[PDB]
Design a protein around this ligand. Structure first.
Ligand SMILES: [Mg+2]
Ligand SMILES: [Mg+2]
Lengths: 253, 253
């Protein structure tokens, strides 16, 4: 009669709350310095830049902005994950219904409503880039509002799956955002919220090593801001040999 | 044939690696400012200060230090958790054996070995406060060393369960550390690594609310630094009514 451990941690624990408040505290102080001293590089990778040699879209004189994934980055999908725990169901038809009717069972990630208000008081535009469907743009706007995250506008501050022909790949939308804003901070909970190059090929152990590539490792808490998600997605993969390296194994007596 | 989801995330994913590098990046920049401008308050709560009215031990002119929990804060216990996933076993006799023989199956939390080296290059003493047993101080010293975390000394930079008569409660050891150092940063993965007042009474929902108390919320990423642990401990508690609030519930059609 107890929910899955990952949901206990993410939705129930003070540990996960404190972890989330830490990320937004670091984001806010990073944005503050970039508002006082505008950078030369934005936080979005340039097209053609690989994970083995990263390079970024220039900041120029474009208006300052911050980009956020929606689900489990700024908004907790409590209603849907409650259904998953009750049912045991990955059901795409249930999630499509959730995208349309879930606006009254969402909550802000701890500190996300304060963080969004402070960014707008600093003159920084808040842009959402999410893989919710374009056809559900309006209920998504209402759910973001009910979570205390402000007013999103499709095509200006809200970009959805199907706005282009790239599907779940977010690089296209990131390039569109970077072409009109100078993004000084980007938040996410899965690595695809920072670059599609983490996905569509690399193995579980390769993706983990890629985060420690020196030009990439410098971004974490310093441009790229991460929130916890041990409940679903690209972080919950791999067999025994990819989770526990063979030189670090041990047996009880 | 796949490990538990929480271990997939924590030990296998790039998401958890990036989350950990973000915490240490924020810690390093926080310590840098406190070395340039010594604060008046240390980061350890004073005795008698409650979570409803926090107050801290003064910094004074004491040497600067940073305090870390060991397990899943700076050191990953890969060997033991591999055994848990293989077995399904919470076995105190197996963990006691792990405390004595696990020095060759540990790894640093991503960024922890670099973070520890940088702190010592800045002149900041690295102090470990862990609930491993006092009688296992020497194999614990060797495991910390094999994880690339430097040289710990029992009673000077390493404080263990049983060093006083308080058991798993860490407040006593924190007061001893704060009496001789000015702790400018403290890292942990469970709330008991910051104050015993989060435990020994408060419910799952109360502990989560306590992290958002205003004087407490300001500490996260700004003195108190958190690392992820969805595998075991005080973050994996609660029934359905404590994980999913009743005003945020939803049912698929
Ligand atoms: Mg997400
Ligand atoms: Mg720990």
């Amino acid at each position: 009669e107890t929910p899955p451990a990952g949901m206990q941690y993410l939705y129930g624990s003070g540990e996960a709350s404190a972890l989330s408040l830490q990320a937004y505290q670091a984001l806010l102080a990073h944005v503050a310095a970039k508002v006082k001293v505008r950078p030369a590089d934005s936080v979005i990778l340039a097209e053609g830049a690989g994970l083995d040699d990263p390079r970024f879209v220039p900041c120029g004189a474009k208006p300052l902005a911050a980009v956020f994934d929606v689900d489990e980055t700024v908004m907790l999908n409590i209603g849907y994950e409650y259904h998953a725990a009750r049912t045991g169901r990955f059901d795409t038809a249930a999630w499509d219904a959730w995208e349309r009717t879930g606006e009254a069972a969402v909550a802000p990630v701890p500190g996300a409503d304060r963080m969004v208000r402070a960014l707008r008081q600093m003159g920084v535009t808040v842009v959402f880039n999410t893989n919710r469907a374009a056809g559900n743009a309006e209920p998504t706007v209402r759910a973001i509002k009910a979570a205390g995250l402000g007013d999103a506008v499709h095509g200006q501050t809200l970009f959805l799956s199907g706005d282009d022909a790239m599907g779940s790949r977010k690089d296209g939308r990131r390039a569109t955002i970077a072409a009109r804003y100078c993004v000084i901070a980007m938040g996410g909970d899965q690595l695809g919220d920072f670059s599609d190059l983490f996905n569509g090929g690399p193995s579980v152990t390769a993706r983990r090593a890629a985060t420690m590539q020196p030009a990439i490792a410098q971004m974490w808490g310093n441009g790229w801001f991460v929130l916890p998600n041990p409940v679903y997605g690209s972080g919950l993969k791999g067999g025994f040999d990819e989770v526990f390296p063979l030189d670090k194994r041990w047996a009880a007596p």
